Amino acid sequence: QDPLTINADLQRVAEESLNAAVKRVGGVWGSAAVLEIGTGRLLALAPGGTRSVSAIYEPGSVGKLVTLAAAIDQKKVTPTSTFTVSSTRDMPNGERISDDSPHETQDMTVAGIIAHSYNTGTVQIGDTVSDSVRYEYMQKFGWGAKTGITLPSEESGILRPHTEWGDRDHYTTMFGQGVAVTTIQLAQMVAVFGQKGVLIPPRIIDGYGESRQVVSEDTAQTVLNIMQGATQPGGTAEGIGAVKGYNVAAKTGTAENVGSSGSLTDTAATFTALIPAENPKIAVAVVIYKENGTVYGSTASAPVFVDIAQFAMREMKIPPSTVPLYKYPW
Numbered sequence: 310q311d312p313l314t315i316n317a318d319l320q321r322v323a324e325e326s327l328n329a330a331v332k333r334v335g336g337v338w339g340s341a342a343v344l345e346i347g348t349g350r351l352l353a354l355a356p357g358g359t360r361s362v363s364a365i366y367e368p369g370s371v372g373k374l375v376t377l378a379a380a381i382d383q384k385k386v387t388p389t390s391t392f393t394v395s396s397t398r399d400m401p402n403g404e405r406i407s408d409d410s411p412h413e414t415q416d417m418t419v420a421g422i423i424a425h426s427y428n429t430g431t432v433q434i435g436d437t438v439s440d441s442v443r444y445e446y447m448q449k450f451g452w453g454a455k456t457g458i459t460l461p462s463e464e465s466g467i468l469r470p471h472t473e474w475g476d477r478d479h480y481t482t483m484f485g486q487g488v489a490v491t492t493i494q495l496a497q498m499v500a501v502f503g504q505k506g507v508l509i510p511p512r513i514i515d516g517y518g519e520s521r522q523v524v525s526e527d528t529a530q531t532v533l534n535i536m537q538g539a540t541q542p543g544g545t546a547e548g549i550g551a552v553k554g555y556n557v558a559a560k561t562g563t564a565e566n567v568g569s570s571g572s573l574t575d576t577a578a579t580f581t582a583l584i585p586a587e588n589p590k591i592a593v594a595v596v597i598y599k600e601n602g603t604v605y606g607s608t609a610s611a612p613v614f615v616d617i618a619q620f621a622m623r624e625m626k627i628p629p630s631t632v633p634l635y636k637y638p639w
Contacts, residue, residue, distance in 0.1 A: 372485025421639025
């Protein structure tokens with residue numbers, strides 16, 4: 310009878326959690342999108358406003374997944390390829406890249422680099438692929454284009470032609486800066502990894518757009534394996550992103566954004582996840598936006614994911630995980 314895909318109970322959980330999170334953290338707004346894996350169907354979209362489809366922002370390190378997927382799909386790296394991570398790294402083009410927080414220099418695998426979200430590691434993964442190739446992957450993941458959702462006022466976001474990237478953009482676009490995304494694009498993008506490398510355009514009406522192969526089935530699986538590092542000890546979402554009894558694959562981000570002041574005064578805290586990680590049923594993207602302050606993906610947005618996911622697993626009658634959370638050597 311009801312032609313919308315929205316699950317009303319899930320939608321209340323989403324809106325409740327997100328409002329609490331925005332207030333708890335002193336943000337101005339937030340957004341969340343839950344997609345059913347394999348169908349493109351929107352189980353929840355908060356807030357009850359377009360905002361999820363019209364508000365654009367730099368997503369930060371949730372964008373590292375596009376960079377990772379490119380290098381793996383291009384057979385440039387494997388999950389156990391080693392790179393050196395350090396507080397800073399000076400690059401061929403003269404750019405100094407810094408990790409969010411200083412730490413002891415060490416060698417680490419790609420898997421660990423992503424679990425820790427180390428910028429110094431990520432830029433080296435991204436340098437194994439050309440800019441035009443990465444740009445092509447970004448477009449394939451749906452960035453810079455409307456998702457085609459039948460809702461008013463959808464924004465396409467901002468993906469500048471790679472020919473326009475300078476030395477700094479070369480690297481920042483590898484970790485979700487120098488690009489602008491909507492929440493619906495984030496959810497569509499992360500769903501690829503739970504859908505054997507296929508992007509499925511999102512739908513809010515059930516009925517009474519073509520899907521596309523973005524990466525191989527193999528690339529999709531290894532990225533899905535890599536994302537399970539997030540809640541392992543040392544992962545960026547350890548504790549705060551755990552959903553009791555279910556394997557979580559996740560990525561966190563935080564990025565400075567432009568305030569009305571015109572300066573980089575705001576932050577968006579992002580979280581993109583797939584659960585249960587062994588056989589994903591839903592893809593979730595959450596953003597919390599703060600105007601003169603910093604919010605972190607893990608501390609601001611992950612709890613919103615956790616509330617939504619805990620209910621969704623009940624509502625959909627999914628039994629707790631019976632296989633271990635995937636772990637590569639780090």
